[PDB]
From a paper:
Deubiquitinating enzymes (DUBs) play fundamental roles in ubiquitin signaling through their ability to remove ubiquitin from target proteins and disassemble polyubiquitin chains 1.
In order to measure the affinity of the DUB module for other substrates using binding assays, we expressed and purified catalytically inactive versions of the DUB module containing Ubp8 with its active site cysteine, C146, substituted with either serine (C146S) or alanine (C146A). To determine the structural basis for the marked increase in affinity for free ubiquitin when the active site cysteine is substituted with alanine, we solved the crystal structure of the SAGA DUB module containing Ubp8C146A bound to free ubiquitin at a resolution of 2.1 Å. The active site of the C146A mutant is virtually identical to that in the wild‐type apoenzyme 29, with no significant reordering of residues 29. In the Ubp8C146A complex with free ubiquitin, the negatively charged carboxylate of the ubiquitin C‐terminal Gly76 forms two hydrogen bonds with backbone amides from Ubp8 residues Thr145 and Ala146, as well as with active site residues, Asn141 and His427. The multiple hydrogen bonding interactions observed between the C‐terminal carboxylate of ubiquitin and Ubp8 can therefore only occur when the active Cys146 is replaced with the smaller alanine side chain, thus explaining the higher affinity of DUB module‐Ubp8C146A for free ubiquitin as compared to the wild‐type enzyme. The alanine substitution alleviates steric hindrance by the active site cysteine sulfhydryl, allowing the C‐terminal carboxylate of ubiquitin to form additional hydrogen bonds in the enzyme active site and thus accounting for the high affinity of the mutant enzyme for free ubiquitin. The structure of the SAGA DUB module bound to free ubiquitin reveals the structural basis for the 30‐fold higher affinity of Ubp8C146A for ubiquitin.
Numbering used by the authors:
A (entry chain B): 5 to 95
B (entry chain A): 2 to 199, 209 to 260, 270 to 394, 405 to 471
C (entry chain D): 1 to 76
D (entry chain C): 7 to 65, 67 to 94
E (entry chain E): 4 to 21, 26 to 95
């Protein structure tokens, strides 16, 4: 169920592991240049759109920003998450 | 061009005071909540219970929080009519009827001044368009490139700009004037570049600075070619001396000593018994790194941090009584908020000359200092914000500055020419000095 | 007292000194080891260059303190 | 699945962070567009010769009025002027 | 990795106490007033260990342009926190 995902998130927050995932993700994105790339993308989308309307800009930036995440960052963070999940779910 | 829903609320003074009070309250909570509480109580949707289901918004009108990704705040606003929510990652106000953020109302952006706003509007205005980022050239007055390059890094330093615009020096300064006071001259440059003093425009503060500098040190006053690092150290020392001069009652608490100061741990280790005393602690305001036979900045930090056995040092171990050559290591004991790096772009040869080292050294846009701190160590990431480059030889050349401002944008400062430049091109420069500001400490 | 200088290559050298020794005397000892004339040396400790006509004790340099030696990259 | 849930958690973090960055950039440009009806971006010149206003280097014949002696001085000699003039 | 999830370990549901919510974010004020200034990406314990205790910190100093207004009388650029005092 949907109740499962929230319980798990709640676990990751109370154990401190959520902050570790969230910091590590942020550190790696920053270092690979992705934050600066999203800022450059958003600037360009605003120019094209001729409007700063957040809903419109987000619908075009968001899919491209998700694709810009390096495979390296994506797998490293997925691992760190997976290892946290193995401690608390039954397989 | 403004959300009409919020304008409608703002017709009634009391309703307006109520919105600002809740915005102030939400933002105070966001800056004073430990990470676990902040996740559980500001980033958790009241309807789906997930954490970070996209942005989570805190309702202005009730205590509910709802997510972006499953449309849960949007449902709250249709069900109950509560159309305003505060994004819990940044404090921004979203209108769910417009489906846009409200970012262009000065009172909301400056809500911490809400109670004074009558007086604020009438006595102060918004920056002018061409002055808003303080971008302006400084004319070459003879050999002033070593001055202007450093000045541009300083007036684009977010710590120095906050300090200057907060009037900290102005409020306490005894000497009173840009003719005599070096700090007042710096503040006049900021005044001129971001405000109004009310072709050769916007040079008055820089002339004042040239004059103060002549009264203290003629060699660094712009007639002859000088080193940019030496001028950098000269300026910050003047800022510190102004602060000492202004105290009623002469570890320093001035702006320089709370922003640029760190300390090194120098350890001398028995190779006999691993005895780790005495460790010495030396302050620094910058690190000077050797670059010979290296190609990356991290390799230069590695060299600085590498163990050396001291062959000309007289060692006697107090634990084991050994007299073997001691092992010396420099580590960082305390990091500063702004890390300043000087690359030692010069060598002395045993034929009685000096020559510049022109090698390109690769520097990153974000720098992790974890592997350089003495004594697990977390990730400690700085963002690159300024570069001073030198072109020419050891005895003659020219300086240019590159600085980074909000929105990812870099500018190149070459005397009177200020130009827009891509990050990619900045990363190709021959860096002499590098300015890094703290971003993330895990 | 023994102090250290981190030199132009990052190699550390050691000097034998007293707190009352002048900076100019310190520079002449570095010249003996490195060969760099005193007027070309910049000696940095705690963010300040050490000035001729002052002494090590003026700058609170104690045993096993490390000075950083640089030259000047002139430009204008 | 382990991968199912892992991806969901990462996509929560990623979209949160994207939405934060995009909100900060769009409010900022919203404010600038409202505040300056006439707003134009800083000129970017891929040939690298024009300034943030689209002007060329001025280049000499520039002067500055010296406040200390009341006389106009060639701008590129101001530091040399001040050496004599200040004493 | 493709392994299916049966449920949360019941060992774990016990240790952590794992409809729509009744929580109010407004109820956070008292504990927020008791809490020193926090940074989202600057771990407080790490700060005390690796940074000076009087260190000036601006988290994310380039996220927005510098925020100021200009005095109508003297044209000085003023940080928001300095405006009321400047106005004598
Ligand atoms: Zn609206
Ligand atoms: Zn939800
Ligand atoms: Zn509500
Ligand atoms: Zn002053
Ligand atoms: Zn100080
Ligand atoms: Zn020993
Ligand atoms: Zn004159
Ligand atoms: Zn004023």
């Amino acid at each position: 169920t949907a109740q499962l995902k929230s319980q798990i998130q709640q676990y990751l927050v109370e154990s401190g592991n959520y902050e570790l995932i969230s910091n590590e993700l942020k550190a790696r994105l920053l270092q690979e240049g992705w934050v600066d790339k999203v800022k450059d993308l958003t600037k360009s989308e605003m120019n094209i759109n001729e409007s700063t309307n957040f809903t419109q800009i987000l619908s075009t930036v968001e899919p491209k920003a998700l694709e810009m995440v390096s495979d390296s960052t994506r797998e490293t963070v997925l691992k760190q998450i997976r290892e946290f999940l193995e401690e608390i779910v039954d397989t | 061009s403004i959300c009409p829903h919020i304008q409608q609320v703002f017709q009634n003074e009391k309703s307006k005071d109520g919105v600002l009070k809740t915005c102030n309250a939400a933002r105070y909570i966001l800056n004073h909540s430990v990470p676990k509480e902040k996740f559980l109580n500001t980033m958790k949707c009241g309807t789906c219970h997930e954490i970070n289901s996209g942005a989570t918004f805190m309702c202005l009108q009730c205590g509910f929080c709802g997510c972006w990704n499953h449309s849960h705040f949007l449902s709250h606003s249709k069900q109950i009519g509560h159309i305003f929510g505060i994004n819990s990652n940044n404090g921004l106000l979203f209108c769910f009827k417009c489906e846009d953020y409200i970012g262009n109302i000065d009172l909301i952006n400056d809500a911490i001044l809400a109670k004074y706003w009558d007086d604020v509007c009438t006595k102060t205005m918004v920056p002018s368009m061409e002055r808003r980022d303080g971008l302006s050239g400084l004319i070459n007055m003879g050999s002033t490139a070593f001055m202007s390059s450093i000045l541009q890094c300083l007036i684009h330093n977010p710590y120095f700009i906050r300090h200057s615009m907060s009037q900290i020096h102005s409020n306490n300064c005894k000497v009173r004037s840009p003719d005599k006071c070096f700090s007042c001259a710096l503040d006049k440059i900021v005044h001129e570049l971001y405000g109004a003093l009310n072709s050769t425009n916007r040079q008055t503060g820089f002339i004042y600075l040239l004059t103060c500098a002549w009264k203290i040190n003629q060699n660094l006053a712009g007639y002859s070619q000088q080193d940019a690092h030496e001028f950098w150290q000269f300026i910050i020392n003047q800022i510190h001396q102004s602060y000492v001069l202004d105290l009623p009652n002469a570890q320093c608490e001035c702006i320089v000593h709370t922003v640029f100061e760190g300390s090194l741990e120098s350890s001398i280790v028995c190779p006999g018994c691993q005895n780790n005393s005495k460790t010495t602690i030396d302050p620094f305001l910058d690190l000077s790194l050797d670059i010979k036979d290296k190609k990356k900045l991290y390799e230069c930090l590695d060299s600085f941090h590498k163990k050396e056995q001291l062959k000309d040092f007289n060692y006697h171990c107090g634990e084991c009584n050994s007299t073997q050559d001691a092992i010396k290591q420099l580590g960082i004991h305390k990091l500063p908020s702004v890390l300043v790096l000087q690359l030692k772009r010069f060598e002395h040869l045993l034929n009685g000359s000096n020559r510049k080292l022109d090698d390109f050294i690769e520097f990153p846009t974000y720098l992790n200092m974890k592997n350089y701190c003495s004594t697990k160590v977390p990730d400690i990431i700085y963002e690159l914000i300024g570069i001073v480059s030198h072109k020419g030889t050891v005895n003659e050349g020219h300086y240019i500055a590159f600085c980074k401002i909000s929105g990812g944008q870099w500018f190149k400062f070459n005397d009177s020419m200020v130009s827009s430049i891509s990050q990619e091109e900045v990363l190709k420069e021959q860096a002499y000095l590098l300015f890094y500001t703290i971003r993330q400490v895990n | 007292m023994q102090i250290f200088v981190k030199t132009l290559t990052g190699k550390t050298i050691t000097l034998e000194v007293e707190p009352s020794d002048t900076i100019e005397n310190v520079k002449a000892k570095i010249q003996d080891k490195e060969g760099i004339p005193p007027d070309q040396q910049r000696l940095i400790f705690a963010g300040k260059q050490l000035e001729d006509g002052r002494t090590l004790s003026d700058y609170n340099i104690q045993k096993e303190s490390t000075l950083h030696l640089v030259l000047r990259l002139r430009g204008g | 699945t382990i991968d199912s849930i892992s991806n969901g958690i990462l996509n929560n973090l990623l979209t949160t962070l994207i939405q934060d960055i995009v909100a900060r950039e769009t409010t900022q440009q919203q404010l600038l567009k409202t505040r300056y009806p006439d707003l134009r971006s800083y000129y970017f010149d891929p040939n690298g010769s024009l300034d943030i206003n689209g002007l060329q280097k001025q280049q000499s014949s520039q002067y500055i009025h010296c406040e200390n002696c009341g006389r106009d001085v060639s701008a590129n000699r101001l530091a040399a002027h001040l050496q004599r003039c200040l004493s | 990795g493709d392994a299916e999830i049966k449920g949360i370990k019941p060992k774990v549901i016990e240790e952590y106490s794992l409809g729509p919510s009744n929580d109010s974010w407004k109820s956070l004020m008292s504990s927020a007033k008791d809490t020193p200034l926090q940074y989202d990406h600057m771990n407080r314990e790490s700060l005390k260990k690796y940074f000076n205790p009087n260190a000036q910190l601006i988290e994310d100093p380039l996220d927005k342009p510098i925020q100021y207004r200009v005095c109508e009388k003297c044209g000085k650029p003023l940080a928001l926190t300095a405006i009321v005092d400047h106005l004598e």
